[PDB]
Design a protein around this ligand. Structure first.
Ligand SMILES: COc1ccc(CCN(C)CCC[C@@](C#N)(c2ccc(OC)c(OC)c2)C(C)C)cc1OC
Lengths: 459, 91
């Protein structure tokens, strides 16, 4: 009962120069989809019933879920980048890009359809020239989801190595959304005002990033076999059925924060809804510098599952620590420059909707959860990142939601200034991964004892 | 005068049977053989045999999980034998 977690620190020898730092440039580009969202957010302010984002919100819902499913090939194609058939990774790449449709379609279809019931039983709302005019720009704001998957399937074939293009066609992305979002929300000659021609406009440029994929077979050697990518053999086509047990439980695990939804916003309004609701400059600026962080494991992820295929066993699972903690560096250094500062109401030209009279009982989980999970899921993003590992990550989060039961009404059930009160066993749900998760990672890190079935050959 | 095939890799098994995916970087004017004994020398030796870059294959794993010691064989231009490398890790 003392240490059922064996070798503690010894995810280590002398690795100091593990330059997993194209991984940064998975979130140097991935800041791109940050640095669009808020152009559309801070442009459709020239309409004040441009709370558009009300759609652009519960859109991400079915993108980011299904994006899980798709973030799933980040091993697939590294695992076989320890191979040679970049076309037998390709036949998969194609097979997913096909999938990339398929789902994107069937997803954007749920949107495409279901949407309407934005009014049911304990339910409804009615500024009609507002997002009712834009529930018809939920649709346009939706009709990429077919093409976005195919164009996030994009970075799943960045896996490999060259992450350069992703950086380009996202620096050549907010190249556009300004341009196109004005022209299509307003300044015509000729497409005047589908005013929330952000959703109309954004959706445009997916298709543009989409064939910012296509336009990068150009670079080196092929990953092109999209001749009628097909599905069938037995009951149903694998390298597709394969993509299932990886995909699924990362979306259904992205259903974590997809209920850090019903929580992060639900007791933002008791009888006290003031800066309690304003834990969005709280937990929106939580999310902002959370990506550059965590997104590196969703980038570490390659460096591993590939460096498994290249048969470098744990000559890589014992980098899945030297990454873990090279960001664990930043885990602290910017929780430091987190609780430290407060000036979210930057007074330059103006803000988006976050305004001046508020207390900063928010810097109080700029600590709590901020360094103590900075890491805690980039665990999986290397468990999957390496391995099968999200079959019990799905179930990693069987607690990270279902242990927030009263850690939901635990801000509202208090003894002190409990604003981070249900940030209870949800910043302690959140640190039951520094066990549960990485504790698993030095245990299955140590199947590279089981699988490295012969330490050292002749010379 | 040289060295072996080179690398040392059974990964594991389908319990009864086992993987054997070793260094064979290309082939030569080549051929392989793998020994198929355990580690007593009692239950005799057996000879799988293969060609291309193909030390990277697998067995017909016959019994439970006893200690099995299994060699692979180089062969090249002079119809003779680079050097064997060998290993025993059994289930
Ligand atoms: C996935 O949900 C989201 C997460 C973060 C953001 C970024 C927030 N932006 C800085 C915009 C300002 C925040 C704001 C809006 N829009 C907003 C924040 C959080 C919200 O609940 C999730 C919200 O309701 C949709 C609106 C203000 C007006 C209340 C938007 C999101 O969807 C709109």
């Amino acid at each position: 009962l003392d240490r059922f977690s064996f070798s503690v620190f010894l995810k280590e020898i002398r690795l100091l120069t593990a330059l997993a730092l194209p991984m940064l440039l998975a979130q140097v580009a991935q800041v791109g989809i940050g640095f669009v969202d808020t152009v559309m957010a801070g442009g459709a302010g020239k309409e004040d019933l441009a709370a558009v984002a009300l759609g652009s919100s519960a859109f991400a819902t079915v993108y980011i879920t299904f994006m899980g499913i798709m973030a799933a090939l980040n091993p697939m194609i590294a695992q076989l980048y320890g191979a040679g058939k970049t076309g037998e990774a390709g036949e998969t790449g194609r097979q997913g890009i096909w999938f990339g449709l398929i789902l994107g379609i069937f997803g954007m279809i749920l949107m495409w359809a279901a949407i309407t019931p934005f009014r049911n039983w304990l339910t409804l709302s009615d500024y009609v020239e507002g997002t009712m005019a834009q529930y018809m720009l939920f649709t346009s704001l939706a009709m990429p989801a077919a093409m976005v998957h195919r164009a996030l399937h994009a970075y799943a074939s960045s896996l490999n190595r060259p992450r350069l293009i992703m950086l380009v066609s996202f620096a050549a992305f907010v190249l556009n959304v300004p341009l196109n979002y004005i022209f299509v929300y307003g300044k015509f000659g000729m497409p005047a005002l589908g005013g929330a021609g952000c959703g109309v406009a954004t959706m445009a440029v997916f298709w543009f990033s989409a064939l910012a994929l296509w336009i990068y077979i150009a670079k080196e050697k092929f990953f092109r076999p999209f001749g009628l990518t097909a599905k069938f053999g037995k009951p149903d086509w694998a390298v597709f059925k394969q993509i299932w047990k990886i995909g699924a439980p990362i979306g259904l695990s992205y259903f974590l924060e997809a209920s850090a939804f019903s929580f992060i916003v639900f007791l933002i309004a008791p009888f006290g809804e003031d800066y309690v609701a304003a834990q969005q400059v709280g937990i929106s600026l939580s999310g902002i510098l959370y990506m550059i962080p965590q997104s590196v494991g969703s980038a570490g992820t390659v460096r591993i599952g590939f460096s498994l295929g290249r048969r470098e066993f744990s000559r890589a699972r014992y980098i899945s620590g030297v990454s873990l903690v090279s960001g664990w560096v930043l885990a602290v250094i910017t929780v430091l420059s987190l609780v430290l500062f407060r000036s979210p109401l930057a007074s330059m030209y103006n803000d988006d909707p976050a305004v001046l009279s508020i207390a900063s009982t928010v810097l109080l989980f700029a600590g709590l959860f901020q360094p103590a999970d900075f890491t805690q899921c980039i665990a999986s993003y290397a468990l999957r990142g390496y391995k099968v590992t999200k079959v019990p990550m799905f179930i990693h989060a069987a607690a990270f939601w279902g242990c927030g039961l009263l850690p939901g009404y635990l801000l509202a059930y208090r003894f002190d200034m409990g604003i981070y009160g249900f940030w209870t066993a949800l910043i302690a749900s959140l640190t039951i991964a520094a066990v549960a998760l990485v504790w698993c990672l030095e245990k299955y890190s140590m199947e590279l004892v089981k699988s490295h079935k012969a330490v050292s050959s002749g010379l | 005068v040289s060295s072996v095939p080179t690398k040392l890799e059974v990964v594991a098994a389908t319990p009864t049977s086992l993987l054997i995916s070793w260094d064979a970087r290309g082939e030569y004017v080549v051929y392989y053989r793998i020994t198929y004994g355990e580690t007593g020398g009692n239950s005799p030796v057996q000879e799988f045999t293969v060609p291309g870059s193909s030390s990277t294959a697998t067995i017909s794993g016959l019994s439970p999980g006893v200690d099995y010691t299994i060699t692979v064989y180089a062969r090249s231009y002079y119809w003779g034998w680079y050097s064997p490398i060998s290993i025993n890790y059994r289930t």
